[PDB]
Amino acid sequence: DSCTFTTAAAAKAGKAKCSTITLNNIEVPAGTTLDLTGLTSGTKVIFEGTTTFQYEEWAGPLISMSGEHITVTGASGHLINCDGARWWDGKGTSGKKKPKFFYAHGLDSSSITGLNIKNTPLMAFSVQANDITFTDVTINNADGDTQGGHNTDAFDVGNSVGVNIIKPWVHNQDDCLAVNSGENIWFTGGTCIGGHGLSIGSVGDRSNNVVKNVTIEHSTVSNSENAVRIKTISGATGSVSEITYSNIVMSGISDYGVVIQQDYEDGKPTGKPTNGVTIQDVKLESVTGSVDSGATEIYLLCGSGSCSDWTWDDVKVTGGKKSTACKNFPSVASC
Numbered sequence: 001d002s003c004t005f006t007t008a009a010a011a012k013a014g015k016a017k018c019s020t021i022t023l024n025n026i027e028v029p030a031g032t033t034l035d036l037t038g039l040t041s042g043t044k045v046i047f048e049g050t051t052t053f054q055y056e057e058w059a060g061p062l063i064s065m066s067g068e069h070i071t072v073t074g075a076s077g078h079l080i081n082c083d084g085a086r087w088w089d090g091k092g093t094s095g096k097k098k099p100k101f102f103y104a105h106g107l108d109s110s111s112i113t114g115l116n117i118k119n120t121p122l123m124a125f126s127v128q129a130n131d132i133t134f135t136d137v138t139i140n141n142a143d144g145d146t147q148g149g150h151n152t153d154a155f156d157v158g159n160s161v162g163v164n165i166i167k168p169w170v171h172n173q174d175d176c177l178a179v180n181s182g183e184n185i186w187f188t189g190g191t192c193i194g195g196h197g198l199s200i201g202s203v204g205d206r207s208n209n210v211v212k213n214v215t216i217e218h219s220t221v222s223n224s225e226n227a228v229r230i231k232t233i234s235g236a237t238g239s240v241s242e243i244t245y246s247n248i249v250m251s252g253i254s255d256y257g258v259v260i261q262q263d264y265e266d267g268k269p270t271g272k273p274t275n276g277v278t279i280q281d282v283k284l285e286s287v288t289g290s291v292d293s294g295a296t297e298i299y300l301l302c303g304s305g306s307c308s309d310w311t312w313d314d315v316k317v318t319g320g321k322k323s324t325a326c327k328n329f330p331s332v333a334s335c
């Protein structure tokens, strides 16, 4: 049936019988999830007007969706305004408990298109799904730059096979893309502003430490901590392979233009890379741009023998420090 819900509670109660679910100007109650899990296959979900959330310090998610063959869209002029500044305290995962925004867990063979998201209190999309596509999704957390936003990852991917992120537009304060695990991930045409870049990892110490076949391309990173990043955990085991960064342009980079390091311990680099996580088939093709004078252009800190078979074409990162601490990287590459 075609259903239109004006409350989160009504949506949760009636969703199953709806072939079309129009969410009209729903203000999600404090500490509650707009629960759109268990949707019937083929359901179309349309966000209308402005979706808001009442304030409460909690872990989220503000919205959770699951089901197979779900088509999520937003009506013209819609906006999902999380007004995250109410939570932002410059501490992100620390300090006030801030809710994760959208759980796309088990939202299989589904698409989310054109959603306009604003000021997520913490991470935006948590992806743990198969054959999921995010097209023309805009995550505007620009306000977080000056209002204390942190750990406002745009797309966190784990335990997902077949993830397509097409033309996302992101202005946040953490990873534009963060893949802790997954296979067949495609991120293309993205605008990544203010965050931590397009990252694989940190990989290791999870139930799934395999990242395979990730293509990040035609993306532009601006005013971010890093542009191209692959991190693996010290002493951890796992596999990172078939990673392609192609046609990546960067500028306003504060820390690293390109960084692939395997020395993350307790969330911090140590300078001592390990080799339990293999990093194979890394292809950088046309990765160019500038970084800050204080940033390191390229940093490749591989464990012994763990990094193999790379392709390095037209990687030209300028304006920063040229690292003299790189090691164990395939000779085709260079810092």
Ligand SMILES: *[C@@H]1O[C@H](CO)[C@@H](O)[C@H](O)[C@H]1NC(C)=O
Pocket: 162, 163, 184, 185, 186, 213
């Ligand atoms: C890699 O992922 C892409 C995008 O989903 C897909 O077209 C391709 O078949 C995959 N290749 C392998 C070897 O898994």
Ligand SMILES: [Zn+2]
Pocket: 083, 085, 086
């Ligand atoms: Zn506000």
Ligand SMILES: [Zn+2]
Pocket: 069, 109
């Ligand atoms: Zn199917």
Ligand SMILES: [Zn+2]
Pocket: 173, 174, 195, 196, 225
């Ligand atoms: Zn930061």
